[PDB]
Design a protein around this ligand. Structure first.
Ligand code: OGA
Ligand code: MG
Ligand code: NI
Ligand code: ZN
Length: 331
């Protein structure tokens, strides 16, 4: 068995290996990458997502989210308070302000320490989940706006034609902006490209150990657990590496820098934070190996998790027994 310790693997494809996306994902899995739940892909040196980032300031962040924490430093939830619209240029200035900028630090490890010590005492503002793309239409390799769609994958594997579309999303982050512990909708893959700016630190639990994280989460967030049998779908809970280590949960960590891709694998729980002003782009995708994960994915039916139009068909076709109850949650 490849990668039996479930370490995060890092890949350096050549320009030739960068041509066929599906084939490279399957190669990485042949080497055991999926066992970690997360992989890094460093693009060939010849490749670029676009020519420059000089003209992005007029993109609108229609609903910036202020991420307000409750709990203790290592075990907290966050809620998203909606703020007034602002442009990317306005947001970048805000991120760079004395109130919100990254503190002086020695290295990524020191910054990670400061994040876990201090996150809860501040409420950073995140421009998340903005439909759109920063890939140039002429970029033919690993262009997250030109991937094969999940609907087309399900149709190719299962023969059923379904409605729905699959488009990317932009994320504009600042120091301390936080992504809570989650897997993807329907336990899909995700791919994330850090277009610009400061790094993003990731934490991940191997898929084969996801239920260990879930059991710890039900202990640590006991009212949320009683409210919903899949409350990590709410995407609000944080647990620090110190706490994970104290409770024996297997995980790994890695920092993504500008110009790098990360891939999350089916049922790989992940969480993380931004080091400073940055812009990422991400999208879900599927492969044949995903289908069985999609069929087994938990679902939130309490009404909190509220997701896209396109998840309907996935539930309806892969999880017909759950469909009724899940749809009640969506309506
Ligand atoms: O970058 C972020 O804030 C969150 N991204 C992801 O969870 C992802 O790409 O799967
Ligand atoms: Mg612009
Ligand atoms: Ni994710
Ligand atoms: Zn729920």
């Amino acid at each position: 068995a490849q990668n039996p310790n479930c370490n995060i693997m890092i890949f350096h494809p050549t320009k030739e290996e960068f041509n066929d996306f599906d084939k490279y994902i399957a190669y990485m899995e042949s080497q055991g990458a999926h066992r970690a739940g997360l992989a890094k892909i460093i693009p060939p040196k010849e490749w670029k997502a676009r020519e420059t980032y000089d003209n992005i300031s007029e993109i609108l962040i229609a609903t910036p989210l202020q991420q307000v924490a409750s709990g203790r430093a290592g075990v907290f939830t966050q809620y998203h308070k909606k703020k007034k619209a602002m442009t990317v240029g306005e947001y970048r200035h805000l991120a760079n302000s004395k109130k919100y900028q990254t503190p002086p630090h020695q290295n990524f490890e020191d910054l990670e320490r400061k994040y876990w010590k201090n996150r809860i005492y501040n409420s950073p503002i995140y421009g998340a989940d903005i439909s759109g793309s920063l890939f140039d239409e002429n970029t033919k390799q690993w262009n997250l706006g030109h991937l094969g769609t999940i609907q087309d994958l399900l149709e190719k594997e299962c023969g059923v034609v379904i409605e729905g579309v699959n488009t990317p999303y932009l994320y504009f982050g600042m120091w301390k902006t936080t992504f809570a512990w989650h897997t993807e909708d329907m336990d899909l893959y995700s791919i994330n490209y850090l277009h610009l700016g400061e790094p993003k630190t990731w934490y991940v639990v191997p898929p084969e150990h996801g239920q260990r994280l879930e059991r710890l989460a039900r202990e640590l967030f006991p009212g949320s657990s009683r409210g919903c049998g899949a409350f990590l779908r709410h995407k609000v809970a944080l647990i620090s590496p110190t706490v994970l280590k104290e409770n024996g949960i297997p995980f790994n960590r890695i920092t993504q820098e500008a110009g790098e891709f990360m891939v999350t694998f089916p049922y790989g729980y992940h969480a993380g934070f931004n080091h400073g002003f940055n812009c990422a782009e991400a999208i879900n995708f599927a492969t044949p190996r995903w289908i069985d994960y999609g069929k087994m994915a938990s679902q939130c039916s309490c009404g909190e998790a509220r997701v896209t139009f396109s998840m309907d068909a996935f539930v309806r076709i892969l999880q017909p027994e759950r469909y009724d109850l899940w749809k009640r949650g969506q309506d």
